[PDB]
Design a protein around this ligand. Structure first.
Ligand SMILES: [Ca+2]
Ligand SMILES: [Ca+2]
Ligand SMILES: [Ca+2]
Ligand SMILES: [Ca+2]
Ligand SMILES: [Ca+2]
Lengths: 222, 222, 199, 199, 199
């Protein structure tokens, strides 16, 4: 049994998220969770969207808690994708990382393909990743559509917690004031398409482990 | 050596707060901390102030974190006081608990004295309590000015997290809609005085242990 | 010290204070320019630097009847907002309070003894691990200021942390002097420059 | 080491110099873009990097009869002022100088020869240990430029250091070509990006 | 070592020289104040010190075609006379000399490079062992000056030694800039004082 596939018509995956895990050592607090991040859809043409890997931006929950603390450090951050359409849908996905907040985004798949977590897959694929979201014991991720921060090669040792707006304002002065506020931005591409009008494909989840560190009341944190 | 006191001129106490402690079991999260709650000052005359023992109201930090979760349960809540003036300052302090949000506050010390944590002391006293704030190993609290919830005799098994404003609005409809939103309110009295104009005395700290329970993003919690 | 690096330790009054009827909240950057005057005049002839250790301590100087308190704590992202209240301040990294007349058990830190009793030293020391930058440039108050004025986020690379001191307490609407705050540091002086040329 | 990490070592021409009657002070940013046009074209393909080593050497091209001297020192606060006098410059970090005709004992750093004489060699290597940032991003002059002009303190985020070179000598108030500056580096390249997209 | 004791090492420009037709003899006190303007600004912050090491090196700035020679020797009785002739000067303590164009093999002391050639290098290091006084106080020129003029024997209390430099060479009876003298020291600073108060 080798070199023999069986093309399904649909990949089913049932996500049942696990409760957040929080645990405090003396001054550091460690949080590990996973929330859903974005929903994706394909078009006849390329489409590059992008995301800040900062805690406010990563999760709806995250932001609300992580905000009670002055500066964090990522320990792990994973973007993993999961399909919703049948294996008949046309179009693939691509993601990779970028780091100088002043760099323009790629416009070509060609381009996109040399970034740090370059990963790509037909839009109907992705169910291998499931354990990462569920966080189960992974089977064989050979084929998953995951991307993970290169946590150890970030520029700052720690980063302050920033609110979107504070960020923005800053960035607006000079885009690379930004280069402190965030360690990296994730880049997404949806090409391959069939409809000129968007077809919804999959959705992707974030899974992190962050160090929290110098308590502040939320109201004062920007 | 018995029945012999030595009147100091001032009670010194150095508070050095301990880092918050958070620890998650599966769905419940447990938080234990202590923050400063109020500052007190005396006057020639009685003065009854009062406080809601709900998480938003208890601490500046608390509120910001506790807000990421749907409903909590108190496990412990302590109000402990500490002096700042010399043992020459006139006026004592009193605190006790109240529970039907519709009940009018006491106006007499007499009155005040039959409430659930009735505790009182000259305004210059209080340094016995220190361990509770520092949380050290307590020496002899015989004479401390502390008050603690009667956690096991609260009305609801769990309470939803309420924002001040949401509370208020509710209360405004009918004061005892309130009776769900909060398990009890602390009552403070400052009499004894000397100046007609307020003299600052001590300050009091809150020390809690709360159960957190059915995660919600902050933005949606009211 | 190496032939490249200089290590310097010292003590100094970083600042003097009083208390009033009401609250007053100050803040002082934990930058060698602002920590004391000597550090200033010395550090000044070095381009970069690194805090090996830094600590603020208080020493009472008023009567046992002066009524009041001191509260110190640390902030680390200059975009953040100085606590309004003491309340907010009791939640910062390093919170500490004490009656304005207590604190002389701390004298050993200005001294260098081995405070057996650190139990009642009103002191505060920086979490140098958790600092964001490996090293820091020597900024002058001015330059710093002007810089911030553009977009506070920039202060984040100009400095490790800001100390917040609250002085609530009082009897007079008239400030009454209570104490003094001294600094104890072990700076890591780093790549010479001629004073005059530094900002 | 070669994974996702790329290491490469090279040696090229950073720039050429000439002397006048008076003193002229220049500065070079020490970033991959501005160090040489080669590295520049190679490094653009990666998002951020860190200097494992870099160093400037000067090689004479004159007769023994020219009149001048080169000087150089590193500076690290994109915000401080350039020296304005030999003396000032004299206490920068790699202070090094000599007559515009001396220097040959430097091929070696260029050359990549093991040569037990540094005897004299107008060479200055960076103190690649005491850089502010763990790593630095690839910044393209024009951007740098732009940013630095918002506030001359942002650059501090973007570059580990700046070389100062002063040409003082003077025979003629005309400009005399005296030699060249060569950079010798070992850089560690790291998050590949399409070249075209790197500001 | 860094307690209450501070050690630091630096290297800077002590002074510049030029040659005439005739012989000119100068002298430099070798005290922190007068050694350089950097040390000077750093040392003022401390009450007394002792030289662990100090040394002057000369670096050419001319063409190979200048005409002169520098000479130098240390002297230790603020009361004896300056030499008046090469010969005399010839038997001072670091006697060293060469043509104003030689010397490059000295960057090294400046440079802080290990270089197996002192082959020739117009360098003179102090015999930091045979100083009269255990330590010396920080004296500020104008004071020194003043005192020495009471009796030229008080200075002997205030400074460990004096450098003598003679510029003899002569092409022109006009003054020709030939190079500079650089000091390289390792000083041990000791009883901190407000700068402003140190005479
Ligand atoms: Ca912040
Ligand atoms: Ca609610
Ligand atoms: Ca500077
Ligand atoms: Ca770039
Ligand atoms: Ca003196």
């Amino acid at each position: 049994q080798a070199g023999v596939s069986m093309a399904p018509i649909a990949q089913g995956t049932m996500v049942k998220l696990r409760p957040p895990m929080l645990r405090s050592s003396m001054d550091v607090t460690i949080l590990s969770h996973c929330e859903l991040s974005t929903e994706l859809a394909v078009t006849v043409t390329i489409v590059v969207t992008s995301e800040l890997v900062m805690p406010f931006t990563v999760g709806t929950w995250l932001r609300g808690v992580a905000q009670n603390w002055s500066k964090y450090a990522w320990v792990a951050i994973r973007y993993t994708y999961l399909p919703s359409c049948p294996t008949t849908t046309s179009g693939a996905i691509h993601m990779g990382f970028q780091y100088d907040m002043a760099d323009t985004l790629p416009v070509s798949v060609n381009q996109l393909s040399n970034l740090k977590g370059y990963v790509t897959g037909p839009v109907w694929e992705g169910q291998s990743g499931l354990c990462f979201v569920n966080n189960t014991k992974c089977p064989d991720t050979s084929r998953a559509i995951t991307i993970a921060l290169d946590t150890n090669e970030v520029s700052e040792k720690r980063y302050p917690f920033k609110t979107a707006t504070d960020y923005a304002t800053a960035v607006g002065v000079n885009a690379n004031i930004g280069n402190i506020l965030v360690p990296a931005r994730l880049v997404t591409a949806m090409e391959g398409g069939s409809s000129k009008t968007a077809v919804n494909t999959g959705r992707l989840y974030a899974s992190y482990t962050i160090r929290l560190i110098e308590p502040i009341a939320a109201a004062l944190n920007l």
